[PDB]
């Protein structure tokens, strides 16, 4: 029951101060280490920094002058800052406890450092052509278009259809994200029984379902 | 700071060869030598701990070595749920820092991909977007390349590809190509085809269908 969540803002403008809220439960802040680590998208881990249960601080040389640490032992929370943020600051940050190796990680919360501005994705169902040759079994997807910034969670059937699906990293052009899914079952489960395409994107308040339907009268 | 060097960077063995990854660090650090394996989308997950003791409930075919200088990670039968990337870190003085890690894929027999094509969605169509998907599913060796003809002429600009990560089941990969059109580039020709070349077969593997034929 050792668990630790970073709170991250998400979305940052150049120059500007970047919060992230690491609340842990399991163990006494007083006792243990937590410590700061980012991923920059397709890189290597950097440590960051930490916070001592006693309270002492030791920061990477590196980002030194930009980055600080405080807690509070009461609340569970350890709190990160960073100032003078810059486009190589993206990146996935996450807190962690050291007792006898990094054992117990948040999940990491995606920092995107940039002036573009937020915006809801378009969600598209993708039913099969018409013809095909529908037989043994059928593949569907859906397509999530122009949003920003990472990520978007995307699920089949509220995440009861997790077999055999396939999702795409998503792909960024002209500062929109683009990314897509596919889903294949059975030709005897579909369209008989439902299937439903959810899609969250977080950073704009935006959650849609889109049922796939067929393109004809079936 | 005590600089990690991690090798190799990258690493592809068949299934049940054996995996060797060596971390070298700029000063003796005893044995605080931590190693981490990172699935996609998830942190890094502590493997070792003290150089070499196993933490409770990862394989025996884990295990690592060393003392000081030269550490060694090592998989004796890699399985295919091994997949990931791996990294060392050294806790011996600040700043702790990370190997550079080793990014291992698995060989395993070759699969043809499945593909779909999806013409645009009505909803798109609408606002005045198509998009036309192609989705290559299950394939080994990763290397595939797709190409979109419109009326049978390649078409090249504003084509985004995907590629999954190695799949920790069946070792295959996937990949989704979107080729994005305007509504209107999209009704002003009839065939539209990817066509995927893969080392599974001479002749490429065609998906294709008529814009106004169905």
């Known amino acids: 029951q050792v668990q630790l969540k970073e709170s991250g803002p998400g979305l940052v403008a150049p120059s500007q101060s970047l919060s992230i809220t690491c609340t842990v439960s399991?163990?006494?802040?007083?006792?243990?280490?937590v410590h700061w680590v980012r991923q920059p998208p397709g890189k290597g881990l950097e440590w960051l920094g930490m916070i001592w249960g006693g309270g002492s601080t030791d920061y990477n040389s590196a980002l030194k002058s930009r980055l600080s640490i405080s807690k509070d032992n009461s609340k569970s929370q350890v709190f990160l800052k960073m100032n003078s943020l810059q486009t190589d600051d993206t990146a996935m940050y996450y807190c962690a406890r050291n007792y006898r190796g990094f054992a117990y990680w948040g999940q990491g919360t995606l920092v995107t450092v940039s002036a573009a501005k937020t915006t809801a994705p378009s969600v598209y169902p993708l039913a099969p052509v018409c013809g095909d040759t529908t037989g043994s079994s059928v593949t569907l997807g859906c397509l999530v278009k122009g949003y920003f910034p990472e990520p978007v969670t995307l699920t089949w059937n509220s995440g009861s259809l997790s077999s055999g699906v396939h999702t795409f990293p998503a792909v960024l052009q002209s500062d929109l994200y683009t990314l897509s899914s596919s889903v294949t079952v059975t030709s005897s489960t579909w369209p008989s029984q439902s299937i439903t395409c959810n899609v969250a994107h977080p950073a704009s308040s935006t959650k849609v379902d889109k049922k796939i339907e067929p393109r004809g009268p079936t | 700071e005590t600089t990690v060097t991690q090798s190799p960077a990258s690493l592809s063995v068949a299934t049940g060869e054996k995996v060797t990854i060596r971390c070298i660090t700029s000063t003796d650090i005893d044995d605080d030598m931590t190693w981490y394996q990172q699935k996609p989308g998830e942190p890094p997950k502590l493997l070792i701990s003290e150089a070499t003791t196993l933490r409770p409930g990862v394989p025996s075919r884990f295990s690592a070595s060393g003392y000081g200088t030269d550490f060694v990670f090592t998989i004796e039968n890699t399985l295919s749920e091994d997949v990931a990337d791996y990294y060392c870190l050294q806790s011996d003085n600040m700043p702790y820092t990370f190997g550079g890690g080793t990014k291992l894929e698995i060989k395993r027999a070759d699969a043809a991909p499945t593909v779909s094509i999806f013409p645009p969605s009505s909803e798109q169509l609408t606002s005045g977007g198509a998009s036309v998907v192609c989705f290559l599913n299950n394939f080994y060796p990763k290397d595939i390349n797709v190409k979109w003809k419109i009326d049978g002429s390649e078409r090249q600009n504003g084509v985004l590809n995907s590629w999954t990560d190695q799949d920790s089941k069946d070792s295959t990969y996937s990949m989704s190509s979107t080729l994005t059109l305007t509504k209107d580039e999209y009704e002003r020709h009839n065939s539209y085809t990817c066509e995927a070349t893969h080392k599974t077969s001479t002749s490429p593997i065609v998906k294709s269908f008529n814009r106004n034929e169905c």
């Open positions: 399991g163990f006494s802040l007083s006792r243990y280490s």
